Amino acid sequence: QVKDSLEQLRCHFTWELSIDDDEMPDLENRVLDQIEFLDTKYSVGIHNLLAYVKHLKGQNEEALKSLKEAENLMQENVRSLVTWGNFAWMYYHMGRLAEAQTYLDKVENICKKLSNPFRYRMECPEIDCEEGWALLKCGGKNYERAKACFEKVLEVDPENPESSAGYAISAYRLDGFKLATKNHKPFSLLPLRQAVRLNPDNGYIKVLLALKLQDEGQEAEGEKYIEEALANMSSQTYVFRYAAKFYRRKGSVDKALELLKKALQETPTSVLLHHQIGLCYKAQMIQIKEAPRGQNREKLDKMIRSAIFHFESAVEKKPTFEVAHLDLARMYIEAGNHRKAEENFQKLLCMKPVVEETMQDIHFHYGRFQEFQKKSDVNAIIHYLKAIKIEQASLTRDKSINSLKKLVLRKLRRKALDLESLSLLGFVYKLEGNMNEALEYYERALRLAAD
Amino acid sequence: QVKDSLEQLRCHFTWELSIDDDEMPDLENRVLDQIEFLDTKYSVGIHNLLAYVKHLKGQNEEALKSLKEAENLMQEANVRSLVTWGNFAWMYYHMGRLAEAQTYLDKVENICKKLSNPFRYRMECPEIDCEEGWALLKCGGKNYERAKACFEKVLEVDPENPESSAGYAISAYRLDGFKLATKNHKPFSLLPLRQAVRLNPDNGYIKVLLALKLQDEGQEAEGEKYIEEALANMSSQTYVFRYAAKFYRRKGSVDKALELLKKALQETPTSVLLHHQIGLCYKAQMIQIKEREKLDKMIRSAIFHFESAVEKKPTFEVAHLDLARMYIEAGNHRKAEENFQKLLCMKPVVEETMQDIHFHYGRFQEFQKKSDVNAIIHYLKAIKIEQASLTRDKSINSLKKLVLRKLRRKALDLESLSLLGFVYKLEGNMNEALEYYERALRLAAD
RNA sequence: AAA
RNA sequence: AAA
């Protein structure tokens, strides 16, 4: 009966935060990193999230210490209702019901005073934002909801700085999910400009705008914001993360490594940094290949070794880091370690990424591996088709269609009356939009089928 | 040397008239019918054609009689004489009387030179262009495109010429009849028919054609006005009865149409067009009864008249088809098969007709012979003639029905899957067409 | 956080 | 000249 009341409270226990079991350690580390290095006006939500994590670990006593710390720092506000809601849920799981009802009454009293329509569900913009920040911290499966929280606020107060920031970040990350789909549009460009305007001293938002400007070819304008963000000390380690990405994609790879190595001293468990660092060594590996033996060779194997070390570290800390697992498997091919590349690809082939489009790249690169390392056109076709089976138009999907086409044409030159090759070729022409030639080949193949 | 000059004369011997052997008896009759009952200003052409027909029969002496009869009524000077003189030249050449052939050659040369004609023997004038058009228009449908060209050639210099306006309108009307069942068929012969009536106000033959064409285009009321005008006047009676009867039959007044056909048959009993029209009347009354002694009686009468038409003109394709379809009504599946196989060996001048042959034979195989396989064979053969039409759309539907029936008994039949995909392709559903092709190609994995 |  |  008390449970029916607790379920109405707005807090981490009722926000249906999707948290995979394999992501708990990395989540905890990312929460702790944020407590130390992220500069924000309010730090109530982050400590409340830490408490919820502790609870999920079975350390309920430790959660109360993070809730009580969240309340002490609050002294230095309606957002307290989030803390009181977690208090109520905690005491409930611990059998201390009497104390739980006290915090239910605290929430009810405030709800009573603010003429709130609900007995326990406080309807205000601050708590909408707290829900948004929690979702935006617990993995990509929650970003659509997170954007909705912030968007809900901007429908009544379009210049609310906090929601404008959460909305911009969510939109930017969702754009990142679709960065390789055809006709993808920068929905997050204007929201980011608006967020920077309403948070002029926020560097975290400035670097995201820079990267989005770089995405749209306006690289020069983006670097202006990079320099502005690096100026203020606000959340500098996070500015180092995204500043490195900008400089790497700009071509100044050496500048990025320096920033990442600095950032790694502060957040040594950041899988994002480990991945970025690996991408840097991968970038330097392509630079030398342009011009290997001697000290030139010792450099590649050293960098390949480092890229593997950091990619291997990222997936160790976060086993759900799919694209890092993919970069790892691809790097083992650069090292000639087909044994380990096969091992990781088999891991990737059993995954179901949140961004399902990523599965195209998994099948595509494994297809190339089959085509070039294993010289097995049969298995290359299987995985080029599986990549194509995810209809969402993209760059990798076009590459899968072309690789399928070229490789199928090779079969027909050795055997022009191969039924399977004719039908696959007709299938290719269907994907290319030329329906007349597709019907032609399907019909030609269906004649050979009549035997 | 003499032959080279004869090949330059404009007459039936150099007009490349396509006359199938089996069409000679009917042509000879239709020519005699025309001489007797068609009222035209100049009857020189039809007698010259009659002469040419007799020459082809091996009766050269009888041909000269028709050329000399053609020269008389003309006098009752005309440039059309060159057609007769040209035929005379050709006749005497075949009969070894070369010296006489040269006499007529000189007569043609003498006229060509006096009229400042560019050629020595080929007279360029609209009168002979019309004569060529009339000859082509009388020797079957394979010549109609050339016929229209002759009259069109004259209308390019004299758009108000009444004679060429009539020939062009009749050729266009018949040519529109060839494409009457094709999709998006346009009535290109309507306005030429109105103009032909304007320039030939006392010509009922053209009036009834304008009526029938109005009936085709939903203007049946306006058409019946011209039908009554043609019947009032008694010019070309028996011919006005033919097309008036068709007009009333397609309206629903069958008894009125039978009255006119039985009158016209007394005058031109050998006309295959009448016997066919009579059969269509009995077929119409048959359908009326359906919606016993009379039914079996008329079926016997319709078969008798269709049988009479094909007997007199073996190349009368659609009459042969109405015959085969009528034997089915009579429960004589043996004669139907016999006549359908005759049709299956034909090659109609109007190739589109072969869709109806295969389509109706497909139905015969589906419903009477209880063989869907042959029905599919012939529905496909009707479809293979890509010209869009009513029958082709019905062949696609009939094929679709059968393939769907087969799939109910066996959903994993490769052939049925591939055919249904072929069907959806003809219907314009490329997406559903590719779907069933891919489904079939999977079963073809082994 | 690859692309 | 069926349609």
Side-chain angles (χ1 to χ4, degrees):
Chain A
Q1 305 189 329
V2 173
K3 181 173 171 180
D4 292 328
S5 301
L6 296 172
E7 292 171 347
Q8 295 184 5
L9 297 165
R10 302 191 67 182
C11 64
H12 299 66
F13 283 88
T14 75
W15 286 338
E16 299 180 51
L17 301 172
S18 182
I19 301 172
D20 185 279
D21 294 278
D22 296 319
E23 291 173 335
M24 280 284 293
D26 171 70
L27 175 59
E28 185 175 348
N29 288 333
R30 291 187 291 97
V31 172
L32 297 169
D33 294 342
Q34 178 172 343
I35 291 170
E36 287 195 3
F37 304 107
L38 192 70
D39 294 320
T40 57
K41 180 164 172 57
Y42 306 102
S43 75
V44 185
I46 188 65
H47 281 100
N48 276 280
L49 178 58
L50 182 56
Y52 185 61
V53 173
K54 295 297 189 185
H55 163 72
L56 297 176
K57 291 225 297 177
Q59 305 173 357
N60 284 24
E61 214 71 30
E62 295 297 326
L64 293 139
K65 313 187 191 180
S66 298
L67 290 163
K68 291 172 183 173
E69 186 171 7
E71 223 179 357
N72 293 332
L73 277 57
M74 180 77 84
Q75 304 177 21
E76 305 173 347
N77 195 284
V78 72
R79 297 168 200 263
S80 296
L81 276 60
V82 178
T83 306
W84 299 344
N86 291 318
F87 267 118
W89 274 91
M90 282 304 305
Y91 293 138
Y92 168 83
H93 284 141
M94 305 169 71
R96 298 156 65 167
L97 293 158
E99 300 182 57
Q101 190 66 53
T102 300
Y103 282 94
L104 280 169
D105 300 344
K106 284 229 194 181
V107 175
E108 186 178 7
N109 282 334
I110 303 299
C111 290
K112 185 185 192 301
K113 292 186 178 72
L114 280 298
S115 184
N116 189 70
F118 298 103
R119 177 180 171 190
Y120 292 112
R121 179 184 169 84
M122 177 61 76
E123 285 288 347
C124 61
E126 292 80 1
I127 294 172
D128 289 338
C129 289
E130 291 297 352
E131 181 179 9
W133 295 120
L135 291 164
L136 190 55
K137 188 71 176 180
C138 292
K141 192 180 170 65
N142 292 307
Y143 290 179
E144 282 294 349
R145 281 187 54 201
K147 186 167 84 69
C149 293
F150 300 115
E151 182 174 352
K152 179 186 169 186
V153 174
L154 295 171
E155 286 172 355
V156 303
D157 181 10
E159 286 206 346
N160 180 265
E162 182 168 14
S163 73
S164 194
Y167 182 90
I169 297 171
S170 298
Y172 171 86
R173 295 186 169 180
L174 292 170
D175 279 350
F177 292 171
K178 304 178 114 60
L179 198 68
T181 61
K182 181 173 179 177
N183 301 329
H184 70 286
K185 304 170 183 180
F187 293 164
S188 66
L189 182 48
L190 298 193
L192 278 166
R193 291 193 189 277
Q194 186 162 332
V196 174
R197 179 175 63 88
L198 308 177
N199 308 264
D201 295 329
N202 194 305
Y204 193 108
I205 304 168
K206 283 178 175 294
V207 294
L208 300 186
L209 175 54
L211 289 171
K212 181 51 57 182
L213 291 164
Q214 189 175 49
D215 286 332
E216 295 298 325
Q218 316 191 27
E219 176 174 81
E221 183 180 355
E223 185 159 0
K224 298 181 181 179
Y225 290 98
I226 299 293
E227 298 188 3
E228 290 185 27
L230 288 167
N232 298 331
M233 304 299 298
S234 57
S235 304
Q236 216 184 12
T237 190
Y238 293 103
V239 173
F240 285 1
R241 297 182 176 187
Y242 299 102
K245 173 175 165 121
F246 184 93
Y247 282 132
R248 176 171 55 80
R249 301 195 306 184
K250 172 183 160 77
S252 301
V253 183
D254 293 84
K255 195 65 143 55
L257 269 171
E258 187 178 64
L259 291 164
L260 297 167
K261 292 216 209 81
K262 284 171 175 161
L264 195 70
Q265 293 178 340
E266 287 157 327
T267 57
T269 67
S270 173
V271 300
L272 191 155
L273 285 174
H274 282 291
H275 185 238
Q276 291 292 320
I277 292 167
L279 297 175
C280 290
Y281 292 115
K282 182 184 180 77
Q284 295 179 319
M285 184 193 72
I286 293 171
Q287 289 182 353
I288 307 176
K289 262 155 164 239
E290 290 285 337
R293 300 185 177 181
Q295 188 175 340
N296 220 40
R297 180 74 199 181
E298 298 286 327
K299 285 174 173 176
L300 277 88
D301 295 327
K302 182 176 179 183
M303 282 138 53
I304 293 173
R305 186 180 64 78
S306 291
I308 291 173
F309 166 88
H310 288 281
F311 293 150
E312 199 70 81
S313 178
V315 303
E316 173 184 311
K317 295 167 175 56
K318 192 174 185 175
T320 61
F321 193 172
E322 296 108 6
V323 300
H325 219 136
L326 181 56
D327 281 321
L328 177 63
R330 294 177 64 191
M331 190 57 58
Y332 279 121
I333 299 173
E334 294 290 348
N337 191 334
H338 296 179
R339 181 184 183 268
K340 299 290 286 184
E342 172 71 3
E343 169 181 343
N344 284 274
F345 277 116
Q346 287 299 320
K347 254 146 204 195
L348 284 152
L349 290 168
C350 295
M351 295 184 185
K352 193 269 118 180
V354 169
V355 183
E356 294 177 5
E357 282 72 38
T358 301
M359 185 60 60
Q360 296 182 332
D361 303 84
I362 289 173
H363 286 304
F364 171 75
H365 291 297
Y366 192 57
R368 297 191 78 75
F369 178 62
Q370 290 292 340
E371 182 179 358
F372 294 105
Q373 282 66 71
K374 301 295 182 183
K375 300 288 237 302
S376 178
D377 295 350
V378 180
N379 280 278
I381 292 172
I382 287 170
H383 292 280
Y384 291 154
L385 287 171
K386 283 175 168 165
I388 293 165
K389 188 63 178 170
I390 295 168
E391 277 189 68
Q392 177 52 238
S394 60
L395 288 164
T396 293
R397 209 219 181 204
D398 284 335
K399 295 211 248 175
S400 301
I401 295 169
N402 295 329
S403 296
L404 177 63
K405 188 175 186 177
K406 297 178 177 181
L407 180 151
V408 161
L409 292 172
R410 258 162 52 182
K411 292 189 174 186
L412 287 172
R413 270 182 276 126
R414 292 191 308 269
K415 178 174 183 179
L417 297 178
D418 181 21
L419 177 143
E420 188 178 344
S421 294
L422 290 172
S423 53
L424 278 178
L425 183 61
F427 176 66
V428 168
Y429 284 135
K430 184 179 79 152
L431 303 174
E432 294 181 341
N434 184 227
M435 309 309 191
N436 274 325
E437 289 291 80
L439 294 166
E440 235 170 271
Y441 276 99
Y442 282 172
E443 292 171 1
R444 191 199 290 190
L446 279 164
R447 293 172 212 159
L448 286 75
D451 280 14
Chain B
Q1 186 179 4
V2 178
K3 184 69 177 301
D4 291 38
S5 302
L6 290 172
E7 295 178 344
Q8 194 170 321
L9 293 166
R10 299 187 66 185
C11 61
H12 298 70
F13 286 83
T14 69
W15 282 342
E16 294 185 345
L17 298 177
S18 186
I19 297 173
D20 179 75
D21 299 273
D22 299 329
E23 292 177 337
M24 283 273 289
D26 175 70
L27 175 63
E28 188 174 345
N29 288 334
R30 292 184 294 101
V31 170
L32 300 169
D33 296 329
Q34 182 167 336
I35 289 167
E36 184 173 11
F37 303 104
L38 189 74
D39 296 317
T40 47
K41 298 172 175 181
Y42 298 100
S43 57
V44 63
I46 191 68
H47 283 97
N48 278 281
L49 175 57
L50 181 59
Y52 183 67
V53 170
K54 295 189 184 300
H55 159 70
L56 293 175
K57 295 208 301 178
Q59 305 175 355
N60 294 267
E61 287 289 349
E62 298 293 323
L64 294 171
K65 296 175 180 175
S66 296
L67 298 177
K68 295 168 184 172
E69 184 168 1
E71 210 166 1
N72 293 342
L73 297 177
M74 183 76 84
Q75 307 187 12
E76 307 170 5
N78 197 288
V79 73
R80 298 167 197 265
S81 295
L82 278 59
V83 182
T84 309
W85 300 348
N87 285 326
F88 271 121
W90 275 94
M91 284 304 307
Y92 293 138
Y93 176 82
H94 284 305
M95 304 171 68
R97 296 153 67 165
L98 293 162
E100 283 177 296
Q102 187 67 48
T103 301
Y104 283 91
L105 281 173
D106 299 337
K107 291 175 177 178
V108 178
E109 187 179 15
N110 176 69
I111 301 300
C112 290
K113 200 167 57 165
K114 185 170 208 68
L115 301 177
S116 309
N117 187 69
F119 304 103
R120 184 165 179 244
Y121 299 110
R122 175 183 177 83
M123 176 63 76
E124 286 286 350
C125 63
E127 293 83 357
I128 293 173
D129 288 340
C130 290
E131 293 296 347
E132 186 184 355
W134 296 124
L136 293 160
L137 190 56
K138 189 71 177 178
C139 296
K142 196 190 177 195
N143 298 305
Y144 290 1
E145 289 291 358
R146 284 182 56 197
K148 186 172 78 181
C150 293
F151 304 115
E152 190 162 10
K153 178 185 172 190
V154 176
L155 294 167
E156 288 170 4
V157 303
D158 185 15
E160 294 297 89
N161 182 269
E163 182 177 356
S164 70
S165 180
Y168 180 88
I170 300 165
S171 295
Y173 171 82
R174 296 184 173 182
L175 286 170
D176 280 340
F178 290 2
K179 302 180 176 293
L180 188 65
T182 61
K183 187 176 179 179
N184 290 17
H185 64 264
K186 265 62 183 184
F188 290 100
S189 68
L190 182 52
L191 298 201
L193 279 162
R194 290 193 191 274
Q195 175 168 331
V197 173
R198 172 169 59 97
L199 306 175
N200 299 259
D202 296 280
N203 197 306
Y205 192 108
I206 302 167
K207 279 190 172 348
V208 299
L209 301 186
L210 175 57
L212 287 173
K213 181 51 57 180
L214 293 163
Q215 187 181 44
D216 294 329
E217 295 298 324
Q219 312 189 29
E220 181 171 281
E222 183 182 0
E224 188 165 347
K225 239 175 290 181
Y226 290 98
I227 296 294
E228 296 188 358
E229 291 185 26
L231 289 166
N233 296 268
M234 297 171 66
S235 58
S236 307
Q237 269 249 286
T238 180
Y239 291 96
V240 171
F241 289 175
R242 299 178 176 193
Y243 298 89
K246 171 175 172 181
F247 183 90
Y248 288 120
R249 176 175 58 78
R250 300 197 300 180
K251 182 190 184 69
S253 312
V254 187
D255 292 278
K256 181 61 163 166
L258 272 166
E259 188 187 58
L260 293 161
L261 296 168
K262 284 168 172 286
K263 286 192 196 177
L265 196 68
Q266 294 181 339
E267 295 168 295
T268 59
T270 66
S271 180
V272 300
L273 188 150
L274 285 175
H275 286 289
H276 187 240
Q277 287 291 318
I278 294 170
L280 295 172
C281 286
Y282 292 120
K283 179 185 180 71
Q285 294 185 333
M286 182 194 69
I287 296 169
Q288 182 64 49
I289 289 176
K290 296 231 202 79
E291 311 231 4
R292 178 173 192 181
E293 293 293 343
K294 286 217 297 173
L295 188 80
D296 292 325
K297 170 179 148 184
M298 293 191 306
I299 289 173
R300 212 173 301 278
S301 296
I303 292 173
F304 169 88
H305 284 284
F306 296 147
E307 195 67 89
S308 180
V310 302
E311 180 183 7
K312 287 153 183 158
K313 190 177 181 178
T315 66
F316 195 166
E317 292 104 359
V318 297
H320 210 136
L321 177 58
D322 286 325
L323 176 63
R325 294 177 62 187
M326 192 58 58
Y327 277 120
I328 297 174
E329 300 292 322
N332 188 337
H333 297 175
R334 185 118 173 268
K335 295 290 289 181
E337 172 69 12
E338 189 180 286
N339 290 116
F340 276 117
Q341 287 298 341
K342 280 183 165 71
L343 281 157
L344 285 167
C345 294
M346 293 185 184
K347 207 303 274 160
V349 168
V350 183
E351 296 178 0
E352 283 67 45
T353 296
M354 187 63 60
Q355 293 177 330
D356 305 85
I357 292 171
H358 286 302
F359 170 73
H360 291 292
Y361 188 64
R363 298 186 71 75
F364 178 55
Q365 287 295 324
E366 179 182 337
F367 295 99
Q368 277 75 63
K369 309 303 295 183
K370 301 294 172 190
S371 179
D372 300 337
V373 174
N374 280 293
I376 291 166
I377 283 169
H378 293 277
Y379 292 147
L380 290 173
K381 283 179 171 162
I383 293 163
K384 195 92 179 299
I385 297 169
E386 286 159 314
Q387 177 57 235
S389 62
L390 307 171
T391 290
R392 189 172 184 275
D393 292 336
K394 288 152 73 174
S395 301
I396 297 166
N397 273 261
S398 297
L399 179 66
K400 188 178 189 173
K401 181 172 70 66
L402 285 188
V403 172
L404 290 174
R405 249 168 53 189
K406 298 168 61 184
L407 288 166
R408 289 174 183 179
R409 302 183 189 185
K410 182 184 178 196
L412 295 180
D413 181 30
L414 177 143
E415 186 187 323
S416 301
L417 289 173
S418 314
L419 277 170
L420 184 62
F422 182 70
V423 167
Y424 285 136
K425 174 178 136 187
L426 306 172
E427 292 182 354
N429 296 312
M430 305 302 102
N431 274 320
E432 295 297 323
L434 293 166
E435 187 165 0
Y436 280 97
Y437 279 172
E438 289 167 0
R439 283 148 65 103
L441 283 168
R442 294 184 198 108
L443 280 61
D446 290 326

